[PDB]
RNA sequence: CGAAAGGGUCCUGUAAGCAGUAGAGUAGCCUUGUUGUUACGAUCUGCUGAGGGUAAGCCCUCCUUCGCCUAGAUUUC
RNA sequence: CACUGUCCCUAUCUACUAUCUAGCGAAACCACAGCCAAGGGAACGGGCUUGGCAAAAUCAGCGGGGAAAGAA
């Protein structure tokens, strides 16, 4: 219910990248992550971590992982006359295995 | 910063693929237009020459 | 190709219409003539054949059967028709009170934001004077109409579909005076009608649906080659087809919990395949087992109606006895009918030992 | 339910079933079916170590590339103040004792 | 009808399931699926493939000798039909099947007996040379609890409680760059 | 309604690691070896029908978790 | 002698197009026009006769028409 909220999700990119041309899977996985955080947080302004872009491109252009596990953080865009008042920042997180993990809210305190 | 990338290559004696510019100090690099102003930023650590790539013969 | 199906265009409506009910005579008993169901999928059976003159007489035959899920239709209306030099004209439609929200979804294209005011004033004429408008409209059917039909709709909550909009269809009453079938129609209001009562086992029925669509194709697959008669590219599929003489091999109850059990195999199992019907789900209601292939894709509404004529074959007068019904997995090369005899065959697994 | 009745058909099957139940009585009596903290904590302790190995291995893959690239030495890069107090705090070190504020 | 068994792997071959190959010497081979048939045509040995039941019997992963498996067999001398015999046969196979399952489960527990003790000894070895990676509490937490010790009287158990909490108790890569 | 998860159903074929002189073979010690030792060691066996994948046009969900929802633009007798 | 989609008899999979959008943006060709049938002596219609008919504006395919020997 708060404008500022950080949650952790698992993205099943295997079902989102099924049958795609091999030379577009890593570019399309970036767009599907942006589409994921737009829907899950209601914010069109989505920024991806450069180290999240490293995780997607880890095994080349046609080797995107089946399941990535990220944290999406809705923060307030102050700026000066911004078009949108909120934005979501997505970062890859360090877990032993991106399987069997439910969506959870992470407490800042 | 193409001029600074070219001049740092001549100052440091390497190629432009080994010249590294500070991402957080782009405003300071931009004011450097002389080969003495770049020699400042090399000594200060803002322009750094990368080493040779690993070529393990084993 | 055939010039009989020449306007190879898409079907005008998804449901598809009967276009001909059986010819009616008043000496017969009062009965309905059609029904609706949803296509679940197909299975494999073994039938102990009794066909005198056949090479497979008193032998075992393996046949393909189609399962159509049939939740009980709810009768909500009554429509009278009169004869005309111009054709046949609808004179009077009489609905009932307490119309369900499912059929009310049918009269709306955006149910989620509407005020849901359909048939609100029609609910008030049942208690306006004493129901004078309702009784007058039924007496108009009794004294002027030559044949009357019944409006019935299916329920989507009993079926595993993401749709919520019911399918509303007119079903003709045959066999009686117009006075007798009207008193059927008013008495049948607000009442569920099962497929046990409309049809019966060992009966050829007529199946009506819209076929599988294939979009724009060329003459290689649209016509079958190496003005109207010239083979030209266009739409293949999504055509309205009426299929003829399909035998009802079984009518399951849904309550019985041994639907796939026969008198020769004593395994308490249902018709749903092990793992579920692929892209349909589970059948938890009455179902009709139809021999052979049947038009339409899975999840599509199926219209079943009675045969127009008395049959001229011994295939229609054949009692069907089933030996076993396949219940194995549609999702692969399933070699197991129930969950119980897979664990009996496999033995103890690692996850079973860690959980227990 | 997955068996052929005709395979199991055999006369005097009561004698075979009674002898099997007599065997089932002998198997119950001498106990063919009976079931017989420090080990728990060290198993959980080993699970924590195996997780730390995977986290270190994942962070190694974050810096590594598929092909060898020229990289900046750590003596050349400059590291923030807040990262040193954060990492030494995980190591369980008094960061205020070492006057880490230089 | 008869539930057949696959020649290659032994799963039940039901009617209309699979293919049957007839050889010139009079022998018919029934298969349950295309995977079993294709592996037969390229002449691979099912005793070596670990998914076939010939391997499991050869490797001892299910037991063959006991009284209940001897009670089921293929019968070549027919009996006269007897309704009392057929009803009492059905009650036998209900008893037969549940006796098998309760002996299958004991057989599996006996094979897995050494697994339980071996796993704790391997994990005991793995802890003894990895002491530095154990949960250890932050220095700021040990500082907070140093004050608290004096207040409530006590230090030792306080730490054990918050370390038990730390065990009862995932970091993100990178961070936002300030504009 | 959506995203994950769990279970089911299928596909492949027995994961990483650990352990057993089963183990061909390669080598150091002191002296006769009739039973000498000490290390490494392909391969094999067990943990392990394990491990991986599973709807993208497969199935189900008992509080399995988390989130969203009476939007806002046009047109109409 | 051996293989082969050559065929019986065909099905399936991939990439770029074909499709749609944003931006950019020609040429060939063009009397005026484009539904048929029968008749229009000069085996010549598209404009005439008299019949069939005939309802805005459009989007994709096609392979028909709007093309063709000349007489010793
Ligand atoms: Zn098999």
Curated annotation (Swiss-Prot), chain D:
Coiled coil spans: none
Subcellular locations according to the entry: Nucleus, Nucleolus
Functional description taken from the UniProt entry: Involved in the biogenesis of the 60S ribosomal subunit.
Family: Belongs to the TRAFAC class OBG-HflX-like GTPase superfamily. OBG GTPase family. NOG subfamily.
Protein name: Nucleolar GTP-binding protein 1
Recorded name of the encoding gene: NOG1
């Amino acid at each position: 219910i708060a404008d500022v909220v950080a949650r952790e999700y698992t993205i099943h990119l295997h079902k989102r990248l099924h049958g795609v041309t091999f030379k577009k899977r890593a570019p399309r996985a970036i767009k599907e992550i942006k589409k994921f955080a737009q829907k899950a947080m209601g914010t069109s302004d989505v920024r991806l971590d450069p180290q999240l872009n490293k995780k997607v491109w880890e095994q080349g252009i046609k080797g995107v992982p089946f399941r990535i596990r990220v944290r999406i953080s809705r923060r307030r865009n102050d700026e000066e006359g911004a078009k949108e008042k909120l934005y979501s920042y997505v970062q890859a997180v360090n877990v032993k295995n991106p399987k069997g993990l439910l969506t959870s809210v992470v407490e800042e305190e | 910063l193409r001029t600074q990338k070219r001049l740092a290559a001549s100052v440091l004696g390497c190629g432009e693929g080994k010249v590294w510019l500070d991402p957080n100090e782009v405003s300071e690099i931009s004011n450097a237009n002389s080969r003495q102003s770049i020699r400042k930023l090399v000594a200060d650590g803002l322009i750094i020459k990368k080493p040779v790539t690993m070529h393990s013969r084993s | 190709g055939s010039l009989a199906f020449l306007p190879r265009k898409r079907a005008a409506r998804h449901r598809g219409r009967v276009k001909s009910f059986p010819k009616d005579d008043p000496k017969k008993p009062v009965h309905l003539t059609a029904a609706m169901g949803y296509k679940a999928g197909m299975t494999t059976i073994v039938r102990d054949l009794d066909r005198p003159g056949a090479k497979a007489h008193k032998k075992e035959v393996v046949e393909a059967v189609t399962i159509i899920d049939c939740p009980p239709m709810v009768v909500v209306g009554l429509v009278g028709y009169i004869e005309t030099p111009r054709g046949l004209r609808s004179l009077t439609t009489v609905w009932a009170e307490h119309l369900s929200d499912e059929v009310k979804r049918r009269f709306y294209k955006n149910w989620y934001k509407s005020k849901k005011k359909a048939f609100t004033k029609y609910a008030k004429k049942y208690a306006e004077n004493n129901g004078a408008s309702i009784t007058r409209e039924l007496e108009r059917i009794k004294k002027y109409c030559t044949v009357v039909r019944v409006l019935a709709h299916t329920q989507i909550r009993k079926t595993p579909l993401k749709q919520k909009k019911a399918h509303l269809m007119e079903i003709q009453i045959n066999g009686g005076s117009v006075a007798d079938k009207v008193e059927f129609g008013r008495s049948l209001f607000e009442k569920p009608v099962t497929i046990d009562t409309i049809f019966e086992k060992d009966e050829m029925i007529d199946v009506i649906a819209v076929t599988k669509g294939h979009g724009f194709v060329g003459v290689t697959a649209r016509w079958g080659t190496k003005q109207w008669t010239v083979a030209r590219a266009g739409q293949m599929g999504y055509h309205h087809r009426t299929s003829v003489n399909h035998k009802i091999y079984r009518i399951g109850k849904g309550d019985d919990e041994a639907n796939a059990s026969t008198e020769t195999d004593l395994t308490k199992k249902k018709i749903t395949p092990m793992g579920g019907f692929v892209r349909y789900g589970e059948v938890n209601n009455d179902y009709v087992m139809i021999k052979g292939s049947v038009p339409g894709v899975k999840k599509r509404i199926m219209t079943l109606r009675k045969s127009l004529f008395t049959h001229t074959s011994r295939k229609a007068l054949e009692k069907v006895e089933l030996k076993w019904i396949d219940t194995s997995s549609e999702f692969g090369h399933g070699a197991f009918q129930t969950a119980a005899e897979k664990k009996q065959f496999m033995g103890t697994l690692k996850k079973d030992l860690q959980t227990s | 339910d997955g068996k052929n009745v005709y395979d199991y058909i055999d006369p005097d099957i009561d004698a075979k079933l009674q002898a099997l139940e007599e065997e089932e009585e002998r198997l119950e009596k001498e106990g063919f079916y009976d079931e017989d903290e420090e080990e728990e904590e060290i198993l959980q302790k080993a699970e924590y170590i195996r997780e730390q190995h995977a986290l270190i291995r994942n962070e190694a893959k974050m810096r590594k590339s598929l092909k060898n690239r020229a990289i900046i030495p750590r003596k050349a890069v400059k590291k923030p103040l807040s990262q040193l107090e954060d990492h030494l705090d995980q190591l369980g070190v008094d960061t205020e004792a070492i006057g880490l504020r230089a | 009808m008869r539930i057949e068994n696959c020649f290659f792997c032994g799963r039940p071959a039901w009617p209309s399931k699979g293919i049957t190959f007839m050889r010139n010497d009079g022998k018919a081979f029934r298969f349950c699926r295309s995977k079993c048939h294709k592996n037969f045509k390229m002449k691979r040995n099912p005793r070596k493939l670990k998914w076939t039941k010939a391997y499991r019997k050869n490797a001892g992963k299910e037991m063959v000798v006991d009284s209940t498996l001897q009670f089921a067999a293929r019968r070549n001398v027919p009996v006269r039909y007897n309704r009392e015999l057929w009803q009492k046969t059905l009650k036998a196979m209900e008893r037969i099947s549940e006796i098998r399952a309760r002996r299958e489960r004991v057989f599996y527990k006996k094979r897995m007996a050494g697994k339980r003790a071996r796993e704790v000894a391997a994990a005991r070895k793995l802890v003894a040379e990895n002491e530095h990676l154990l949960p250890r509490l932050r220095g700021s937490e040990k500082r907070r609890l140093a004050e608290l010790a004096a207040e409530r009287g006590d230090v030792e158990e306080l730490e054990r409680e918050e370390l038990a909490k730390l065990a009862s108790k995932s970091k993100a890569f990178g961070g936002e760059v300030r504009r």
